[PDB]
Enzyme design. Structure first.
Site, PDB file in Angstrom:
ATOM      1  CG  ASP A 266      -2.080   0.858   1.164  1.00 28.11           C
ATOM      2  OD1 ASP A 266      -2.379   1.443   0.105  1.00 28.11           O
ATOM      3  OD2 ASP A 266      -2.701   0.996   2.231  1.00 28.11           O
TER       4      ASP A 266
ATOM      5  CD  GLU B 247      -0.413   6.691  -2.222  1.00 31.82           C
ATOM      6  OE1 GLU B 247      -0.087   6.742  -1.018  1.00 31.82           O
ATOM      7  OE2 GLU B 247      -1.203   5.829  -2.671  1.00 31.82           O
TER       8      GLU B 247
ATOM      9  CG  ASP C  93      -8.624   4.138  -0.201  1.00 33.90           C
ATOM     10  OD1 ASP C  93      -8.196   2.978  -0.357  1.00 33.90           O
ATOM     11  OD2 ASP C  93      -8.260   4.875   0.747  1.00 33.90           O
TER      12      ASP C  93
HETATM   13  O1  LIG Z   1      -6.279   2.028   7.479  1.00 31.71           O
HETATM   14  S1  LIG Z   1      -4.971   1.744   6.946  1.00 31.71           S
HETATM   15  O2  LIG Z   1      -4.385   2.932   6.343  1.00 31.71           O
HETATM   16  O3  LIG Z   1      -4.074   1.137   7.903  1.00 31.71           O
HETATM   17  C1  LIG Z   1      -5.188   0.579   5.628  1.00 31.71           C
HETATM   18  C2  LIG Z   1      -5.948   1.098   4.401  1.00 31.71           C
HETATM   19  C3  LIG Z   1      -4.994   1.985   3.617  1.00 31.71           C
HETATM   20  N1  LIG Z   1      -5.425   2.394   2.281  1.00 31.71           N
HETATM   21  C4  LIG Z   1      -5.866   1.258   1.473  1.00 31.71           C
HETATM   22  C5  LIG Z   1      -6.957   0.478   2.185  1.00 31.71           C
HETATM   23  O4  LIG Z   1      -7.392  -0.602   1.356  1.00 31.71           O
HETATM   24  C6  LIG Z   1      -6.433  -0.050   3.511  1.00 31.71           C
HETATM   25  O5  LIG Z   1      -7.469  -0.779   4.168  1.00 31.71           O
END
Ligand SMILES: O=S(=O)(O)C[C@H]1CNC[C@@H](O)[C@@H]1O
Ligand SMILES: O=S(=O)(O)C[C@H]1CNC[C@@H](O)[C@@H]1O
Lengths: 667, 667
Positions: A390, A393, A458
């Protein structure tokens, strides 16, 4: 491509179409001086520029060599130009150190269309708008007319706009059947608002501009992915069924796996993003950013992974390139000096929303290797066979120092690719390419090689145009034209804020699109207790089992598309004009796609719909669920919940697979 | 002001402070080429620019004669500089016709502050922001964080921003005690964001820049108004009491007059803006734009005017420089060719919101005299002694032709002063200057002469900072620093939209400020049926009687202030630093004003208040309602409804009047 040039006029042609020109009447390069203002707030960037100088260059000298054409522009720029039948490169040398703004013009005409500039979520055709190139949070809502966007701006500075994306890239494709890439990770702004030219603004003198042409878009994509790279085949196990996104520790997460299986939903894997722990904030239920399995929530996870593997189920996790300041890996990274620092030597702490994290300095080879080893040891080493990789950015531009010595104004857009390379090398060095898969939302030039799978990032949990289900389709098409041929989305979207919550209808419409993509995966979202979840409703689980079965039945076809993407860079989700180049309407459609050469998908992206308007190019089509035949044009088919507007070519070599789907699940 | 100049550097000083410099290291002028995009919707203007060239000029020749200094800048600009002990003019000759963008830099330092740029509603001190100079609707809400602003943007493109104003001006006052004027009505943008310089962007090469210094702000205002103009004294009858804004025809309007008088509220005049008829739209109850009295709504109005005149009460009306296309005067103007036209030759019909109007071409001398005669014949000719002289901001730029032959990009900002001049000449030629008064919300350079009275335009009916009661004070201070020393506001505001309706408390807080201004006037607003009106509530009418009586008791003092304004340009509402130039805090305060030299007013601009924090400069002050003495600094006073935070100088020659007010109406 052919060059024409005198002592004061340069030209470049693609066929009988001029695409580059420099004369006094139509200069090709402007240079200038700017002072930017970049303000980050939790991954959103407000960027303004104060330009004090901008002026076109004078071409004062030309030198032709059998291999090179050299353009001297006063004491500002030298351009070295080299061309083939299909490739021109323009290397730039900067002779005046004052210049930090560079505008490059490409000849254009009013009817031309352009595509790409990375993964675009609002507009596939880029013409008529400009597109800043700066990776960031893409915005919540992304539409100034919606309540969600306005509240996101007011409270979080996070509403964004049509051009924001986790994955911008300074690269576009023209309907003149070329692509142009600017070899620079600086801030850039690709401006397509003028009829007679495209203007490419770069915040440095770029090393090189590359232009390459082809006779077809298929061959153009082959050339694009030769230069940028190609993805591996996906592991065979992804086609076993759904990848279910669940959370809560051993009992809850494996309980939902059992419940899912008991309802006859085929499961390829269980994706527990909280494998490493949870963290609750005002945004919702987030994760503990410390990339080792959480022994209190998931005790004995390595043993448990072996057990579900023996039942044909893979386990998937989550990593990102930051580490929260109260974590064990953070403590180690601090002790080893592996975080980006401030000028005074303190480790830079980024606010991610009520918690603060260090930025592993991926430009430091020792820090890069250390983090690659964290993936090898604590993710791959306990048998995790896939993960969300993930973020990427959030590199700030205020008092931060990187081992490379380059400005964060240059490393900011580079970060997603450094993060991608880290994941790729962990998997490659482990010998696991083709066996494990990670998926990324951020990217840049080179993600074509280093990212095994994109996902659309998202979405809001809604049917809106600029941040709902529909925006996934636009992101698939744009990314595919950049050579990123494998993508998917969160089934049901992610972002729930400001009284916007996921419904059963949205989940199911999202799922009935996802079954015509390489990779089906759900997600509880940021506020699971107040958003619909598929496992909350028996009717949904029954309906979902059918959609997942259809995906597994499509898999013999889908494997050939993934293989074709791996072999030549033809994306799995293609724009209509990729196989119907003469169809004028195909160039304006961004909410239908060709699923391979043999299927057309027009997902329903609006609520309370029972029929759906579909444009079919001129060919012999068969509606999947009814077998009714069509020959091309605007039509309207029934599209009840579960019956994606999907059509296959009559003489497709896979027509038997599609007919089996109709007989089993049609009307 | 002293000049230093050699062959490579020009400098201008005010005392020992350098205000102008041109060297190769710090250039004074940049020039360039831009292509604007002006998006107009019902008086709102979204303006963007595409700059293709901008570059600093090289000083290549200097010629000193006895009185003038000539600076030649290559083949682009010649500047002729002529100075005195207090006045410097720079005349610019354009030697390259391609230039349509002009940036002029003024030397500055970090601690300097700047005031003006017309009537500013959000920020009095301009330092740290930029201010486009373009007359337009000022915005509804004017604050991107409020629901009213957001909805105004979504539905009406009308939210605006901090810099929007009916009355901008390319003129500012510096704390180095000079004012600078750019002699141009082009679009401009005055940029005060940089510590070491102000930068004045002009969308033409301006004819001249004028700089004039003075020892005190009082003397600076004397010089400002010697150059721009001074207003006449207000007619004696305005001090008789309230100007009541009512509507509905003979029976309702004169009925409300009787009701007001029956409640012992002193009335100077009845202002019936619908004297010429009504027009109801989705915005609310508007007017019929045909400037002859409406014989069905107000039959025999001239007779009625005589009757109320015999009782000591004046009648006031309304005109604006447009004519709706179903009116009698429109028909005559169309016949005589007195409207601005499009390129295709037809009359331009501007959409004002569900009705369309011609723009009387005030640059055509025949049309100008015709409209002047309309005012003489149909307003003054029936015995109307004052009127709202509205609008002036709506000249389009897209496809319009003016008799002057000048571009609408130049005449747009010119229109408010042409319209002011129309009203001024009608009144002057009638021999009625000082006897009748019109009030305008739009303006430009020259409004100081041609506008007998400003009003702050449309506020929302609320207590918000950027569009409610408080913004009136900012507008008063900024306008006054520009030499427009007479202003007022709608008591209770005007604009009701998007669930924002006027309350009793708001009306009363507004009225208790207005009694410390030259001119007390109410307004039913755009939606009278669903907004509080003073005549709705007996307690309000009893309170208003007291407030208006206070206004009449102040009149002997207020008259000397209006006379001082007419004689020297010292505005009625003055910034604290105009009389306390050594007080550092006085330069940061924009919601208190000196009401002449002898009073400090700090209006309550928030709801639910019972006390109010006040900063008093060092002096001997007496709180008006209690008699308590204060000697300077931050204080807090009781400030219940009806008890404006108001103080007078203990040694004021008018202390006897102020004591009578405390005795009659104090605590
Ligand atoms: O809540 S978190 O930042 O730890 C994880 C999210 C981050 N952005 C992408 C989403 O799919 C995750 O659940
Ligand atoms: O509604 S009308 O446009 O006719 C009159 C309004 C115009 N703007 C200024 C307001 O005070 C008027 O009531």
């Amino acid at each position: 491509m052919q060059i024409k040039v005198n002592d004061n006029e340069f030209q470049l042609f693609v066929g009988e179409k001029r695409i580059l020109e420099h004369s006094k009447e139509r200069p090709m390069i402007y240079v200038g001086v700017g002072q930017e203002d970049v303000d980050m707030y939790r991954g959103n960037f407000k960027i303004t520029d104060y330009v004090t100088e901008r002026f076109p260059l004078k071409l004062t000298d030309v030198i032709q060599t059998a291999d090179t054409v050299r353009l001297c522009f006063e004491s500002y720029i030298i351009a070295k130009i080299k061309c083939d039948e299909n490739l021109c490169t323009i290397d730039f040398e900067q002779k005046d150190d004052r210049i930090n703004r560079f505008w490059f013009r490409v000849a254009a005409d009013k009817e031309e269309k352009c595509y790409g500039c990375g993964e675009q979520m609002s507009y596939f055709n880029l013409r008529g708008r400009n597109f800043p190139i700066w990776t960031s949070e893409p915005g919540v809502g992304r539409d100034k007319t919606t309540y969600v966007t306005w509240r996101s701006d007011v409270e979080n500075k996070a509403g964004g706009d049509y051009y924001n994306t986790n994955y911008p890239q300074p690269t576009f494709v023209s309907t003149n059947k070329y692509y142009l890439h600017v070899d620079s990770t600086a801030y850039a702004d690709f401006d397509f608002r003028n009829d007679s030219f495209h203007e490419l603004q770069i915040w440095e003198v770029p090393k090189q501009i590359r232009i390459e042409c082809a006779d077809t878009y298929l061959k153009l994509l082959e050339r694009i992915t030769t230069y940028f790279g190609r993805q591996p085949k996906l592991p065979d196990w992804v086609y076993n069924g759904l990848i279910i996104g669940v959370q809560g520790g051993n009992e809850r997460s494996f309980g939902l796996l059992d419940k899912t299986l008991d309802r006859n939903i085929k499961v390829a894997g269980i994706w527990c993003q909280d494998w490493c722990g949870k963290r609750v904030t005002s945004f919702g239920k987030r994760l503990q950013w410390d990339w080792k399995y959480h022994k209190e929530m998931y005790p004995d996870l390595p043993k448990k992974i072996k057990e579900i593997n023996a039942k044909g189920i893979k386990f998937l996790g989550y990593v990102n390139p930051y580490l929260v300041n109260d974590g064990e890996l953070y403590k180690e990274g601090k002790e080893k000096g592996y975080f980006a620092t401030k000028a005074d030597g303190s480790d830079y702490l980024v606010d991610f929303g009520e918690f603060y994290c260090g930025v592993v300095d991926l430009t430091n080879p020792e820090a890069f290797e250390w983090f690659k080893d964290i993936i090898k040891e604590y993710t791959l080493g306990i048998g995790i066979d896939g993960w969300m990789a993930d973020f990427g950015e959030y590199l700030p531009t205020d008092d931060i120092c990187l081992y490379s010595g380059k400005s964060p104004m240059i490393e900011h857009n580079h970060w997603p690719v450094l993060w991608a390379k880290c994941n790729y090398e962990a998997v490659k060095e482990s010998g696991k390419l083709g066996d494990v898969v990670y998926f990324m939302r951020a990217g840049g030039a080179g993600s074509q090689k280093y990212c095994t799978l994109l996902w659309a990032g998202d979405q809001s949990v809604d049917f809106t145009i600029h941040d709902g289900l529909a925006s996934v389709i636009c992101g698939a098409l744009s990314a595919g034209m950049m050579g990123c041929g494998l993508t998917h989305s969160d089934i049901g979207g992610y972002t729930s804020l400001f009284d916007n919550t996921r419904t059963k209808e949205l989940f199911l419409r999202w799922a009935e699109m996802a079954m015509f993509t390489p990779f089906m995966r759900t997600h509880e979202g940021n506020r699971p207790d107040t958003n619909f979840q598929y496992y909350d409703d028996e009717d949904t689980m029954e309906r979902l089992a059918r959609l997942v079965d259809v995906y597994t039945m499509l898999a013999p076809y889908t494997k050939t598309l993934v293989e074709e993407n791996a072999d030549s860079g033809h994306p799995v989700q293609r724009p209509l004009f990729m196989h119907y180049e003469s169809d004028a309407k195909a160039y304006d459609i961004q909410y239908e796609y060709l699923f391979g050469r043999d299927m057309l998908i027009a997902p329903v992206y609006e609520q309370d719909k029972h029929e759906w308007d579909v444009y079919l190019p001129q060919d012999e089509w068969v509606h999947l669920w009814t077998g009714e035949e069509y020959h091309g044009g605007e039509i309207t088919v029934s599209a009840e919940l579960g019956y994606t507007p999907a059509f296959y070519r009559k003489n497709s070599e896979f027509a038997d697979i599609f007919e089996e789907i109709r007989e089993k699940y049609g009307v």
